[PDB]
Design a protein around this ligand. Sequence first.
Ligand SMILES: *[C@@H]1O[C@H](CO)[C@@H](O[C@@H]2O[C@H](CO)[C@@H](O)[C@H](O)[C@H]2NC(C)=O)[C@H](O)[C@H]1NC(C)=O
Ligand SMILES: *[C@@H]1O[C@H](CO)[C@@H](O[C@@H]2O[C@H](CO)[C@@H](O)[C@H](O)[C@H]2NC(C)=O)[C@H](O)[C@H]1NC(C)=O
Ligand SMILES: *[C@@H]1O[C@H](CO)[C@@H](O[C@@H]2O[C@H](CO)[C@@H](O)[C@H](O)[C@H]2NC(C)=O)[C@H](O)[C@H]1NC(C)=O
Ligand SMILES: *[C@@H]1O[C@H](CO)[C@@H](O[C@@H]2O[C@H](CO)[C@@H](O)[C@H](O)[C@H]2NC(C)=O)[C@H](O)[C@H]1NC(C)=O
Ligand SMILES: *[C@@H]1O[C@H](CO)[C@@H](O[C@@H]2O[C@H](CO)[C@@H](O)[C@H](O)[C@H]2NC(C)=O)[C@H](O)[C@H]1NC(C)=O
Ligand SMILES: *[C@@H]1O[C@H](CO)[C@@H](O)[C@H](O)[C@H]1NC(C)=O
Ligand SMILES: *[C@@H]1O[C@H](CO)[C@@H](O)[C@H](O)[C@H]1NC(C)=O
Ligand SMILES: *[C@@H]1O[C@H](CO)[C@@H](O)[C@H](O)[C@H]1NC(C)=O
Ligand SMILES: *[C@@H]1O[C@H](CO)[C@@H](O)[C@H](O)[C@H]1NC(C)=O
Lengths: 99, 49, 50, 50, 198
Amino acid sequence: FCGKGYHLMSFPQSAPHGVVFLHVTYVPAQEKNFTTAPAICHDGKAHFPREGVFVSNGTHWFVTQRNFYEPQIITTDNTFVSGNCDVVIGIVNNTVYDP
Amino acid sequence: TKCTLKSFTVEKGIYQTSNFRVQPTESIVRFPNITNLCPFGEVFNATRF
Amino acid sequence: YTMSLGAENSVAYSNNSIAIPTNFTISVTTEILPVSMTKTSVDCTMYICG
Amino acid sequence: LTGTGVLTESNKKFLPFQQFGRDIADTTDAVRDPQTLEILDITPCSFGGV
Amino acid sequence: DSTECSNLLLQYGSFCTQLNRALTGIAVEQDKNTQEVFAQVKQIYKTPPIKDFGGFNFSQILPDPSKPSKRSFIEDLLFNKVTLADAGFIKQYGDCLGDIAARDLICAQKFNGLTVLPPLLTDEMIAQYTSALLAGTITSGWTFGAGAALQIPFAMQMAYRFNGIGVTQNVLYENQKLIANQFNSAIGKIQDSLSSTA
Ligand SMILES: *[C@@H]1O[C@H](CO)[C@@H](O[C@@H]2O[C@H](CO)[C@@H](O)[C@H](O)[C@H]2NC(C)=O)[C@H](O)[C@H]1NC(C)=O
Ligand SMILES: *[C@@H]1O[C@H](CO)[C@@H](O[C@@H]2O[C@H](CO)[C@@H](O)[C@H](O)[C@H]2NC(C)=O)[C@H](O)[C@H]1NC(C)=O
Ligand SMILES: *[C@@H]1O[C@H](CO)[C@@H](O[C@@H]2O[C@H](CO)[C@@H](O)[C@H](O)[C@H]2NC(C)=O)[C@H](O)[C@H]1NC(C)=O
Ligand SMILES: *[C@@H]1O[C@H](CO)[C@@H](O[C@@H]2O[C@H](CO)[C@@H](O)[C@H](O)[C@H]2NC(C)=O)[C@H](O)[C@H]1NC(C)=O
Ligand SMILES: *[C@@H]1O[C@H](CO)[C@@H](O[C@@H]2O[C@H](CO)[C@@H](O)[C@H](O)[C@H]2NC(C)=O)[C@H](O)[C@H]1NC(C)=O
Ligand SMILES: *[C@@H]1O[C@H](CO)[C@@H](O)[C@H](O)[C@H]1NC(C)=O
Ligand SMILES: *[C@@H]1O[C@H](CO)[C@@H](O)[C@H](O)[C@H]1NC(C)=O
Ligand SMILES: *[C@@H]1O[C@H](CO)[C@@H](O)[C@H](O)[C@H]1NC(C)=O
Ligand SMILES: *[C@@H]1O[C@H](CO)[C@@H](O)[C@H](O)[C@H]1NC(C)=O
């Protein structure tokens, strides 16, 4: 609607019989593949991400926001628990570290 | 404005009005300086056509 | 020529794979949009009579 | 050529075989006066820009 | 068939030229309408082979590569339902009234000058835009036109879209099979409704 990428700002400028918008937008680049999971079964209970997604680098699991790779250690503050892990399809086994 | 809108009540705003204000009172005729009469006697009253 | 529909590229879909960016660019683009046109009117007495 | 309007002095130049002037081709603007050979341009009496 | 066609053109040509400039502006407006509806994102994504859509059966809207046409099943039903010029006017016109992509010069003669201009976007190019929109949507979600489409599993996109309506992801991930079955049943009821000739 207001430029390619994620919109941030738009600056109007007057123009002969019109207006010119200077759209300042966020264009992502240098993407990386990651092995992702919907939830994590720890201690017999499923942990779902409060914000972001569960991805893995090598054999270590982190939670990151979707639009930028910021690896954060999986924490009980970062996740929420709902039910058991027998019902979630695609759940992986990992530990949820507590502060 | 009333004659342009064909109504005795006009509303608030601007209105473009056609000309009714000026009427010509004098007429001028300008012809070339010609004195002699045309020879229609030669054309019309010739002995033989 | 034929009209270009867009940039040809492919994306690899998998049930356990995601793509997350590691960098970004801040891009300023210009979009030009007309707002008004030339306001014109006709004068009736000059148009009809002259 | 009969009409109703106002005349001004014009800076136009006429060829010797030309008598009337029509830049818009539906209104006679410039004319050559028959007695004095000055060229007078005719604008309408109606000031409709009101 | 006038003998004095040049004089008739000199006396009445600019009137028809203005009217034809109005009709051409209308036709260009129709082309801009088609572009602003279908060509919002000018990126063409190839249709993926059907592989792990989370139980969501998209085969009726996502087009098959086996057919020579780019259309899908539901699209085929939509174009088969609306026959062009299937109206009383067809008997007099001979289908000259609408674009069959085969209209010939004889139709202009029948309509006294009136011609039907073909659209700028071929129905193949509209079906390709629709297929690119579908493939990009299913594969990526919101990152489609943001540039650099970022692959994501469809279940996680559905979890994010439940987060959009204020429902936690556990509702989806506990009831994924039920939601997929409901979606497939709704798609089947739409197909049967389009196939019912109503
Ligand atoms: C994935 O990335 C994380 C974060 O960089 C790695 O975790 C750290 O890696 C460094 C270098 O290997 C170690 O010195 C730290 O002790 C690690 N800390 C943690 C959180 O364990 C992680 O090793 C990477 N995994 C793989 C296998 O690539
Ligand atoms: C996650 O770990 C649990 C054990 O903590 C696994 O559950 C066991 O899996 C083995 C092999 O399938 C079975 O023989 C046991 O009967 C299971 N025990 C339980 C507690 O159910 C579970 O399969 C692992 N899941 C993943 C994704 O690897
Ligand atoms: C992301 O890309 C930007 C450029 O778009 C990189 O910025 C450059 O950083 C290097 C090293 O610090 C400088 O030498 C360049 O002058 C910078 N260029 C610009 C455009 O400012 C940035 O480092 C990249 N980040 C990653 C992680 O690749
Ligand atoms: C999605 O549903 C369609 C039907 O709407 C499935 O197509 C059927 O495939 C089966 C064989 O598996 C045939 O017996 C049917 O006759 C097919 N119907 C039609 C009209 O094609 C399609 O296989 C389903 N997709 C998946 C993978 O579940
Ligand atoms: C909510 O309603 C849905 C149907 O809209 C129920 O789903 C059915 O569940 C029963 C029992 O598990 C199954 O026999 C049916 O096959 C399901 N139907 C569908 C469409 O999948 C669901 O159980 C209801 N939930 C509650 C708590 O009432
Ligand atoms: C991600 O994986 C696909 C297929 O495995 C590959 O085509 C693509 O280049 C990969 N991207 C990165 C950034 O590794
Ligand atoms: C992804 O697909 C592969 C191949 O069908 C399958 O083995 C795997 O279990 C699937 N994973 C999930 C989470 O659906
Ligand atoms: C036309 O000629 C006749 C013959 O001389 C003459 O009697 C008459 O007056 C003339 N009429 C005019 C108008 O000159
Ligand atoms: C026309 O004749 C009048 C009367 O003698 C004279 O005043 C005027 O100058 C003449 N105009 C010419 C010769 O252009």
